[PDB]
Structure formats: C-alpha cells, structure tokens
Ligand code: HEM
Ligand code: HEM
C-alpha cells in the first residue's frame with residue numbers, strides 16, 4: 001500500500017510507504033482525530049523486550065547494508081543471551097549513535113530535522129552519581145555552545161533498569177530562567193518555571209529573585225534523591241535583546257539564553273529506555289519571540305511593547321498585538337545575529353524542512369510530520385509548510401514524554 | 415468519554431458527542447491524516463441511486479434525529495413520517511424533506527462543520543427553499559435574491575439557498591462557480607497571470623462559453639448555472655447587487671494607489687449538502703468574512719494575488735533576507751487595511767481575534783448542552799499570528815457528524831456536454 005501527500009502551493013505529490021513500518025499509536029481512531037491533543041494516550045518483561053530488540057538490530061544492520069550477515073546473526077544471538085540472563089541488554093556504541101540520530105530523524109514535531117545526521121553523541125552510560133552527571137552536562141553545554149557557533153549534541157545517561165534506579169534531569173531544559181510568584185499575585189521572571197523554582201528553593205537554592213535568574217541543575221542518579229548544582233556562569237551564553245530601529249527596545253531589559261537544551265524527555269532505542277538524555281540544537285526565532293515572550297502565560301510583553309510603539313490598543317481590529325509581535329521577533333533575530341549566535345528564522349527553517357521532507361520521501365519512503373507543531377506560531381500561511389500535506393505516525397527509536405519526576409519520586413532523606 | 419484541555423486557561427471539557435460519528439476521518443490508530451485536505455472517501459450511500467436497503471436506513475436515522483430534537487421520538491407524527499418515507503422510496507427510489515426538516519438539516523450541517531470558526535451563529539441561518547426550480551434561469555433568480563438578501567446593504571446576513579436534490583446523477587443541479595462572487599484570472603502572453611490565479615481554469619470555460627472578458631485584475635465572473643443536468647448557462651450578476659470594498663490603510667496614504675478591492679459577500683457554491691442520505695449538489699451558502707481570509711490567503715498566498723512584494727516595496731523594508739521579517743511586517747499592515755476598509759464602509763467583517771474568541775465560547779456552549787463540538791484545529795487556527803489567538807492553545811477533537819457539507823467533484827470533470 002501507498003499513501004499520497006500533496007503540496008497545494010506547488011502541486012508536488014509525494015508517496016509514503018514508510019508508514020507501513022509504524023509501531024505504536026497516534027492516539028487517533030478510525031472515527032476520531034486527536035491530532036491537536038498535546039499528550040494523546042513499570043518496565044518491560046523478557047518476552048516484550050526480545051521482539052523490540054530484534055526489530056532495532058535488524059534495522060541497524062539493514063542501514064549499514066549488512067542484513068543477514070554473520071555479524072548481524074551473531075549480534076542477535078548476543079542480545080538474546082543478555083536478555084535471557086539479565087532481563088536487559090547493552091547497546092554497542094555504534095548502535096547508540098545510530099539510535100540517537102534516528103530518534104531525532106523520527107521526531108515528527110521537529111522542524112529542524114534536515115540536520116539530523118550531524119548530531120554529536122556523548123555516551124554517559126558509565127555515570128553513577130549526580131556529580132558525574134553535572135560534569136557530563138557542563139562538557140555538553142561547553143561543546144554545544146562553541147562560543148556562539150552552536151553544535152547539536154546529546155548526552156545519554158544509563159538506561160532504566162527496574163524503574164527504581166532512574167537517572168533524571170529534573171530541569172525541563174538545561175538552561176531556563178526562574179519564576180517567582182509574588183504576594184500580590186504577580187510573577188517575577190518566567191511563569192512557566194514557578195513550580196520547578198519552588199522545588200529548587202526547598203532543596204536549598206538561594207534565589208537572587210531577579211527577572212532572568214539562570215536556574216540550578218537538579219540531577220538524579222540511580223534513583224537517589226536529586227542534588228543541586230550551579231552551572232558555571234561562563235558556560236551560559238546569553239543575548240541581550242535590542243531592535244535595529246527602536247532605540248527604546250533595549251530599555252525593556254530583555255535577554256535570552258542561546259542554547260535550547262531539552263532535558264525532560266525519554267529516549268527509546270530497541271526497547272531500552274534512556275530517561276535522562278539532554279539534547280540541544282539552536283533556536284528558531286519564534287520559539288523565543290512568539291512563545292517565550294508573548295504567550296499570556298509566559299513573559300507576556302505584548303502590552304508593554306505596544307505601548308512604546310504608541311499603538312491603538314483600544315480595539316483588537318487595529319491588530320496592535322500582531323504589529324508588536326512582528327517587531328519583537330525582528331528584535332530577537334537581529335540580536336542573535338549581531339552577537340553571532342546561531343539562530344534560524346521561521347521562513348528559512350520551514351523552507352529547509354520542505355527540502356528535507358522531499359529528500360526523505362525519495363530516499364526513505366516518507367517523513368512523519370506533525371503539521372500542528374511544524375507550522376510556526378506566527379505567519380503560518382506565508383511559510384511553505386502550511387500548504388504541505390503531512391502524515392503523522394510513530395517510528396522507533398523515538399523521543400517520548402515522561403512524567404515529571406517530582407510526581408513519582410519517593411524521597412529518602414530524614 | 416474523551417477530554418480536551420485548554421493549555422492557557424486549564425479548562426477541561428469532556429466529549430461524549432463523538433459516539434455519534436458516522437464517517438471515517440481517514441486516521442487510524444497508527445497514522446494521523448489531520449493535515450490531509452480530503453483524507454477520506456467514506457460516503458454513506460454509493461455513487462448513484464441507492465437501493466431501498468441503502469437509502470432507507472439513512473433516512474430513518476435523520477428522521478429519528480429530527481424527531482428526537484423536538485422531543486417527539488416515537489410520536490404519532492414520527493411513525494407516520496417513517497411510513498411516508500418508506501412509501502416514497504418504494505415508489506420513487508427517493509424521498510422529499512418537509513420544510514421544517516430541511517431547515518433543521520441545513521442548520522445542523524453548519525453546526526457540524528468542524529472546519530468553520532463562525533459556528534456560534536449556526537442557528538441564525540435563513541434557509542431559502544428552491545426545490546421547485548427547474549431551469550438555469552430560475553436558478554439565477556433564486557441566486558440574485560439570495561445575494562440581495564444576504565448583502566443587505568452591508569449588514570450581512572447568513573443564508574443558504576437549496577436547489578433540487580440529486581436523483582439519478584444525470585439530472586444534477588450545479589453552480590459551476592466555486593463562490594457566487596469571484597474575480598477572473600487570465601493567462602498572459604509572457605507566462606504570468608492577471609487577476610486571480612485560482613480561477614484561471616474556470617475563467618477559460620466562461621470565455622469558451624461566450625463570456626467577453628474585460629481582462630482586468632478584478633473582473634467579477636459571470637454565473638455558470640446547471641439545472642436538471644443540462645448544459646450550463648452564463649449569467650451576469652447585476653453589479654448593483656455585488657458589494658465591493660476599496661482597500662485603503664488608516665496610516666499609509668499610498669495604500670489606496672495599489673488599486674486593491676474585494677467583495678463583501680463570501681458565498682460558497684460548490685459544496686454538497688447531505689441530509690438523511692439525500693444529496694443537494696447545489697446549495698450556495700454565505701455569511702461574512704474573517705479579515706484573514708482576504709488579507710492573508712486571497713492577497714498573500716504565492717499562488718493567489720501575491721501582493722507582499724508590492725506592499726513591502728512601498729513600505730521601504732529590507733527585502734534582502736528572510737530574517738528581516740519583511741513578509742510578516744507587510745502582512746500585518748495589509749490585514750489592518752482590510753479590516754479598516756470594511757469597517758469604514760460599514761460592511762460586516764470580523765477580525766481573527768474576535769472570531770477565535772467567539773469560537774472558544776461556542777465550544778464551551780456546545781460541550782455544556784450537546785456533549786461535544788467537532789473541530790479541525792488545522793483549519794480553525796488563523797493563518798497569521800496563530801499562538802496569540804486562544805484557539806491555538808485549545809485541544810480539539812475532530813469527527814464527522816451528519817447532516818453535513820461535503821466536497822464534490824468539479825462538474826467540468828464529469829459533465830458530458832450536449
Ligand atoms: C538543530 C537545530 C534544531 C532546530 C532549529 C529545532 C527546531 C525545533 C522546534 C522549533 C521545535 C518546536 C519546539 C516547541 O514549539 O516547543 C522542535 C521540537 C522538537 N525537537 Fe527540534 N530542533 C533542532 C534540533 C533538535 C535536536 C538536536 C533534537 C534531538 C536530538 C530535536 C528533537 C526535537 C523533539 C523531540 C521535538 C518535540 C518536542 C516536544 O514534543 O515537546 N531537535 N524542534
Ligand atoms: C457567519 C459568518 C461566518 C464566518 C466568519 C465563517 C468563517 C469561516 C472560515 C474563516 C472558514 C475557513 C475558510 C477557508 O479557509 O477557506 C470557514 C469554513 C467553512 N464554513 Fe464558515 N463562516 C461563516 C458562516 C458559515 C455558514 C453560514 C456556513 C454554512 C451554512 C458555513 C460553513 C462552512 C464550511 C462547510 C466550511 C468548510 C469549508 C471547506 O471545508 O472548504 N460557514 N468558515
């Protein structure tokens with residue numbers, strides 16, 4: 001069977017056969033589509049693990065043109081021995097690298113996948129303590145930041161065993177700003193991070209109580225209670241936000257960090273679960289300029305910017321929000337570019353994604369893609385992805401959501 | 415039960431209405447087709463005249479639903495209605511809707527249109543019964559009256575005009591236009607396109623049928639009307655019925671010199687209305703515009719009027735690199751102009767902020783009284799400034815309820831001319 005997707009702007013038609021490989025659920029049924037649901041839906045037994053491991057090893061050996069080889073058959077036997085004797089197995093370094101890259105390649109919500117095969121993989125599977133995790137994360141941050149010439153990277157900590165000894169980065173990204181709820185109901189800093197900021201303070205973090213306090217790392221090794229660490233400030237690259245035409249913009253006192261580094265997701269390779277696997281790339285401008293700054297639940301700067309622009313804010317049909325949103329996103333891109341910190345605008349990013357998508361259909365037979373996430377949060381239809389039909393399905397290896405660790409961790413101290 | 419969450423407000427709604435869905439969405443538990451324009455060809459009855467065991471179950475379903483809606487399930491009139499429909503199908507292979515059933519069905523087709531952000535208005539719909547129509551001349555009369563009623567000197571009113579249902583498939587009534595009012599598009603000698611590129615094919619059919627094109631950038635197309643399966647016939651809508659808005663900007667005095675206009679009445683005329691297994695292949699319906707339909711899609715799509723270049727030039731933006739966001743900046747100004755122009759001429763229009771806010775309210779009303787609201791996020795979220803509208807942050811369930819509006823093939827792909 002084949003499925004066709006059409007681009008309604010160019011009339012190009014692509015043919016998807018890769019979906020026949022899909023594994024788990026989208027969340028939809030034959031009679032209901034759940035494509036706009038954010039999250040649609042203890043450890044694997046021996047019997048469950050065998051077929052998952054085989055499927056991954058088969059696809060690895062097919063990727064390197066050695067399917068059926070003596071080395072292929074011996075690896076399968078070796079993996080089977082380990083599962084039989086230990087209820088788990090260990091990836092070779094080559095398989096871990098291949099698996100991490102393909103989880104990125106398979107991330108249907110990521111528009112930056114043209115870069116998927118250029119991913120620096122740091123193997124941290126020998127780590128045993130939160131101090132060791134801190135060291136690996138500092139090295140990742142330094143390598144990835146690269147004085148502003150950002151490089152994609154992932155660091156992979158030891159895989160889940162019985163579920164009682166999980167490695168976890170409690171942060172949602174390696175670098176984020178604190179949020180503080182005030183007595184009068186206002187919020188200082190980033191409202192998204194209020195809860196995690198409270199956990200840090202409880203663990204003994206002494207907060208500066210400013211608007212852009214870089215949060216400490218809260219690291220959990222081997223299922224133990226998590227521990228606090230301060231990222232050395234010289235490793236945290238930041239960009240002050242100014243505007244090429246409005247001299248007053250710099251007086252808003254805005255800044256942002258250069259390195260987007262997701263740390264709360266789970267990486268699944270051949271049935272193995274890597275619950276701590278922070279990965280980083282570089283920003284698309286709208287992530288900061290539209291969501292971080294202008295979401296009503298975030299820094300929410302539209303009103304203040306529109307004021308300094310002298311816009312008519314009495315009626316929505318003046319489009320004062322739309323006008324202010326564009327200028328903010330102009331400022332974000334100008335600031336990063338002026339400081340020579342890698343960033344991509346949404347027009348360039350979506351154009352590259354269409355090229356990537358077409359290449360993937362030709363060389364791989366498809367490209368799972370989540371239109372709801374791929375289309376940027378402003379100016380949707382003037383980007384090419386808006387007009388591109390897409391098919392969403394789940395391939396493995398994959399990145400997955402997982403529960404926040406404070407909702408499941410059972411504490412040990414006192 | 416299925417829950418939907420709003421991630422801005424944390425409101426959670428519980429959906430039971432989806433249990434009443436009839437047609438496949440196209441998705442499976444392994445693949446999602448939510449961004450496919452036409453994901454499914456699952457229809458309720460086969461291509462042409464059904465047999466009795468194919469049509470009667472669908473009729474019984476709709477009549478049951480209608481009499482349930484008015485608290486008369488099993489009533490004397492309900493059971494007679496069923497026997498009446500059974501005899502009609504028995505003797506004519508079809509059946510006829512009562513006036514009240516037709517009105518209920520049209521309003522519910524709008525209420526069930528998951529892609530429409532305007533549905534808070536669904537019960538305020540004027541229904542023109544045109545099922546006595548027999549000729550293209552009669553269709554033109556009915557359409558002129560619809561347009562005049564719906565335009566209402568700029569205080570627009572939602573309406574639908576319903577022509578005779580399909581019988582055997584060779585006597586279809588069709589409006590060949592895709593909307594009652596659109597602009598012509600012309601292929602130029604050098605290869606470019608003048609006017610609206612979306613309508614180049616339809617324009618050529620009209621010229622081929624004897625229409626004399628003025629060959630401008632905003633030539634209102636004639637109507638091409640097909641009655642009872644006969645060859646279609648051309649008619650010129652009287653221009654005093656065609657309300658148009660010249661586009662200007664509240665700050666940029668040069669904007670008027672771009673010479674842009676648009677029409678006030680959005681009037682979809684190429685969809686199919688399905689009620690109880692009956693197919694109304696000509697059912698033009700109209701409401702009023704959301705500004706972004708004109709200012710974002712009609713004006714700024716690359717394969718439409720494609721005016722971003724022109725506007726940005728006049729604005730003296732840096733068009734050297736995408737990252738100056740000159741396209742985004744011009745886009746906003748164009749949409750300010752469109753809203754300001756319609757509002758200045760007292761022609762009904764809604765901005766995407768007010769429309770999406772109304773739809774969230776509609777969603778809450780529908781979950782409270784009906785147990786659900788089918789909604790297509792891909793279509794509901796406006797094509798600019800998505801995440802600063804509330805629907806961006808609203809999870810939605812999409813499912814197919816009947817009565818409904820459906821796509822149908824373009825008639826020049828199937829008509830054998832006489
Ligand atoms: C190299 C430059 C990259 C760019 C420009 C980019 C861009 C993006 C953007 C704009 C999003 C949506 C983010 C949001 O709205 O919250 C996203 C999501 C995502 N990215 Fe990428 N990305 C890049 C690299 C990577 C890398 C290196 C990985 C992993 C190895 C990755 C994996 C993902 C995943 C799994 C998601 C979905 C997250 C979720 O579901 O919440 N990306 N990306
Ligand atoms: C009264 C004001 C209305 C507003 C503001 C409105 C708004 C919209 C918008 C913006 C779209 C997306 C159109 C596109 O992107 O091409 C749409 C789609 C749609 N509307 Fe409404 N609408 C209104 C009235 C109506 C009425 C009266 C009906 C039928 C009786 C209707 C039925 C539909 C249908 C079926 C679609 C989907 C069309 C498709 O799939 O191509 N709408 N509406």
Ligand SMILES: C[C@H](O)[C@H](O)[C@H]1CNc2nc(N)[nH]c(=O)c2N1
Pocket residue numbers: 035036037038372373374421806807808809810
């Ligand atoms: C409800 C909806 O699914 C949700 O708001 C999504 C929409 N699309 C998105 N797209 C991206 N890139 N990031 C997001 O957080 C979201 N949020």
Ligand SMILES: C[C@H](O)[C@H](O)[C@H]1CNc2nc(N)[nH]c(=O)c2N1
Pocket residue numbers: 008386387388389390448449450451792793794
């Ligand atoms: C491929 C994609 O589904 C297609 O471009 C859709 C996206 N969303 C849309 N939304 C609306 N309202 N109208 C449209 O025409 C489209 N086009």
Ligand SMILES: Cc1cc(N)nc(C#CCCN(C)C)c1
Pocket residue numbers: 260261262265279280281282283284287
């Ligand atoms: C590597 C990367 C680059 C980028 N530009 N963006 C992201 C992201 C995200 C969202 C993560 N999600 C858990 C909220 C990730």
Ligand SMILES: Cc1cc(N)nc(C#CCCN(C)C)c1
Pocket residue numbers: 680681682685699700701702703704707
């Ligand atoms: C009544 C109505 C009002 C409005 N504001 N918009 C539309 C539309 C549309 C698109 C239909 N589709 C076949 C392309 C329809």
Ligand SMILES: [Zn+2]
Pocket residue numbers: 028032033034035441445446447448
């Ligand atoms: Zn779906």
